[PDB]
Amino acid sequence: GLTEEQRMMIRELMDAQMKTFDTTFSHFKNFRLPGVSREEAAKWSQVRKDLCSLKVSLQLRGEDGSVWNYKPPADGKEIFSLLPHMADMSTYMFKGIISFAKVISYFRDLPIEDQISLLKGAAFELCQLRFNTVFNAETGTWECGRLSYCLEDFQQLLLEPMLKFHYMLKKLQLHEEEYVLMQAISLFSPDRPGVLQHRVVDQLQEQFAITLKSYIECNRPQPAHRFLFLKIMAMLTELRSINAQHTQRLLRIQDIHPFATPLMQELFGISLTERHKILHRLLQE
Amino acid sequence: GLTEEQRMMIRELMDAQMKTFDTTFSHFKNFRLPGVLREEAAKWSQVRKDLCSLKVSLQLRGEDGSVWNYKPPADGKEIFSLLPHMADMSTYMFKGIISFAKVISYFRDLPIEDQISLLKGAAFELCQLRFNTVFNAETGTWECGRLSYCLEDTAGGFQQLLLEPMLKFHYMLKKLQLHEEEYVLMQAISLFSPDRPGVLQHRVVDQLQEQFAITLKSYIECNRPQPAHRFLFLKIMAMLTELRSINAQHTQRLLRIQDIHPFATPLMQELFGIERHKILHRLLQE
Numbered sequence: 068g069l070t071e072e073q074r075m076m077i078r079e080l081m082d083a084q085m086k087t088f089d090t091t092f093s094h095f096k097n098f099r100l101p102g103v104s105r106e107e108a109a110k111w112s113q114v115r116k117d118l119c120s121l122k123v124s125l126q127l128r129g130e131d132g133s134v135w136n137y138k139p140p141a142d143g144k145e146i147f148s149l150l151p152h153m154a155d156m157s158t159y160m161f162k163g164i165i166s167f168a169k170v171i172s173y174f175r176d177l178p179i180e181d182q183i184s185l186l187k188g189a190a191f192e193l194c195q196l197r198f199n200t201v202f203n204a205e206t207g208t209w210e211c212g213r214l215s216y217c218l219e220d221f222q223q224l225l226l227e228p229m230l231k232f233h234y235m236l237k238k239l240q241l242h243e244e245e246y247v248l249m250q251a252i253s254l255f256s257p258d259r260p261g262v263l264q265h266r267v268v269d270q271l272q273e274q275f276a277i278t279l280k281s282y283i284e285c286n287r288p289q290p291a292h293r294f295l296f297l298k299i300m301a302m303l304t305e306l307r308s309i310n311a312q313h314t315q316r317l318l319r320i321q322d323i324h325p326f327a328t329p330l331m332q333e334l335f336g337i338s339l340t341e342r343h344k345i346l347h348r349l350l351q352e
Numbered sequence: 353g354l355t356e357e358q359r360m361m362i363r364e365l366m367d368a369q370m371k372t373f374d375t376t377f378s379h380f381k382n383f384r385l386p387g388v389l390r391e392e393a394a395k396w397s398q399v400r401k402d403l404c405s406l407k408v409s410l411q412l413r414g415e416d417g418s419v420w421n422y423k424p425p426a427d428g429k430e431i432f433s434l435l436p437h438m439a440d441m442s443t444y445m446f447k448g449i450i451s452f453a454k455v456i457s458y459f460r461d462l463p464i465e466d467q468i469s470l471l472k473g474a475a476f477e478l479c480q481l482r483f484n485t486v487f488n489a490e491t492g493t494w495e496c497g498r499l500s501y502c503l504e505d506t507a508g509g510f511q512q513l514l515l516e517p518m519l520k521f522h523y524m525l526k527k528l529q530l531h532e533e534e535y536v537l538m539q540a541i542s543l544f545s546p547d548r549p550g551v552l553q554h555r556v557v558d559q560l561q562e563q564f565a566i567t568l569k570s571y572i573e574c575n576r577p578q579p580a581h582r583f584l585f586l587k588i589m590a591m592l593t594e595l596r597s598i599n600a601q602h603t604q605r606l607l608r609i610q611d612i613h614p615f616a617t618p619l620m621q622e623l624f625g626i627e628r629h630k631i632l633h634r635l636l637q638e
């Protein structure tokens with residue numbers, strides 16, 4: 068079995084996930100909706116390539132049973148139509164991740180600078196891990212309560228590394244304990260930009276990784292997924308590569324079409340404490 | 353061929369239609385839309401049967417090419433979700449019909465009370481005739497510019513739609529493949545109905561209706577192949593007779609819905625009887 072500290076470690080992470088992951092997205096309100104220069108022109112071409120890779124239709128299910136469905140247009144600024152909404156979704160998700168990190172005892176004891184640096188480097192990764200738990204691989208749809216995001220028209224989709232990540236991770240059929248441990252391992256990455264206490268974060272990540280390794284051996288005897296632990300660690304390595312690629316994508320689009328919310332601006336590159344006033348405020352409550 | 357008086361009649365009606373029928377619905381703006389979220393029971397039960405008869409989805413195409421689609425909920429008060437939009441659409445269509453009648457010389461010379469009585473009796477029918485020209489029978493969709501109203505997919509399929517006499521009328525009328533001139537002549541024959549409630553100059557209106565009918569009869573004889581269009585005029589007049597029965601049915605349906613859930617605009621209230629025609633008098637005086 069697991070040690071007393073290992074079981075309590077999983078118990079704390081699971082309680083954190085329940086307190087801070089709004090799976091029904093019931094409290095995601097007041098969001099935006101679509102339809103509701105030579106140096107600049109050159110940067111547009113690359114931004115158009117970034118936006119056509121992830122094209123989803125939007126579905127809004129009302130309490131009465133009615134459904135409002137948004138089908139995106141074909142490629143001007145029309146390819147930016149979903150950005151103000153996705154910014155509000157990302158910002159809403161990031162607030163839940165910030166709250167997730169705050170209740171973890173190992174994260175709360177860290178200096179405020181390292182708390183800022185770890186959340187900055189892992190925000191995208193923990194959000195994709197949370198999005199994968201509501202991803203329907205049969206329909207290609209992220210089901211976020213009354214909101215749904217359906218991929219628009221497979222081997223072309225799998226070429227997109229972010230979409231391939233969600234299909235591959237969903238195929239592993241992970242439990243909630245394995246997702247929340249993946250979030251812990253990703254959150255406590257010691258080699259994030261700006262981390263000071265490099266060794267103590269490295270030591271915390273090793274305890275979360277050993278706990279995941281021990282959990283799988285004690286709760287997963289089915290050969291359904293052999294080497295599940297090493298497969299998970301490979302997905303986290305791939306998730307770090309996708310994080311760098313898509314963080315560059317957002318900066319390119321933000322350069323010619325500003326959409327990032329004030330919380331996202333601190334999350335990207337738009338003295339550590341002074342440059343992250345909102346993150347510092349949220350991390351105090 | 354047609355006589356000069358009959359050609360001038362068709363020419364006046366086509367100009368009336370061109371000036372007053374916004375076929376692209378470009379000037380239908382600021383309309384409302386469904387949100388993003390013992391004896392009283394007998395009124396409700398009949399109204400639930402009344403509102404389940406016509407089930408459409410709403411489609412709004414944006415200028416950039418995007419498409420917002422609204423699928424109505426399944427049968428509370430949610431079965432009313434489309435009423436404010438339909439009240440806006442109907443009010444807009446009725447104004448175009450009033451303007452249509454207002455430029456017809458034979459209509460303006462009638463007494464003002466007969467003008468109001470003819471409009472109240474024919475508003476639904478001229479609205480349905482205009483809607484039929486933008487009805488796509490292959491997709492079951494009224495294409496109104498950037499707005500589209502599509503019959504919802506049902507387990508009964510196409511035969512299910514034919515249960516509603518209103519829908520059967522649109523498919524049957526579209527099957528005739530009528531010209532623009534025949535549509536505008538149908539509207540004139542419907543508008544000048546001498547047996548509407550409250551009509552005083554019964555003989556004058558009846559004589560005006562027969563001239564429009566004779567003109568339509570002569571148009572079909574002179575501009576359509578003799579063999580297969582031998583009874584098109586009689587088929588059209590039978591469609592107008594059936595459209596009048598559907599008018600009586602759906603007017604009663606609207607009054608029942610209004611009795612338990614008010615939705616009619618001020619102009620619609622004057623149209624269904626819900627000084628009595630203050631807005632109608634102003635519109636006819638402009």
Ligand SMILES: CCC[C@H](CC)Oc1ccc(C(=O)OC)cc1NC(=O)c1nnn(-c2cc(OC)ccc2OC)c1C
Pocket residue numbers: 121122123149150153154156157160161190191194195198209211216313314315317334
């Ligand atoms: C709700 C389900 C969304 C789906 C799930 C994978 O995926 C999309 C589908 C479609 C689109 C799209 O059609 O848009 C126009 C965009 C995204 N996805 C992000 O918009 C996005 N997901 N994560 N992040 C992000 C978050 C960060 O902090 C938390 C930091 C950086 C980030 O990105 C570099 C973003 C902007």
Ligand SMILES: CCC[C@H](CC)Oc1ccc(C(=O)OC)cc1NC(=O)c1nnn(-c2cc(OC)ccc2OC)c1C
Pocket residue numbers: 403406407408434435438439441442443445446449475476479480483494501518602603606623
């Ligand atoms: C959008 C147009 C296409 C289709 C053709 C039948 O229309 C509907 C589609 C769906 C519905 C519906 O799903 O309902 C909840 C209702 C209507 N249609 C009227 O709502 C309506 N059409 N004509 N009139 C009306 C107008 C009058 O003066 C102009 C006078 C009386 C009238 O009716 C008694 C109404 C209220």
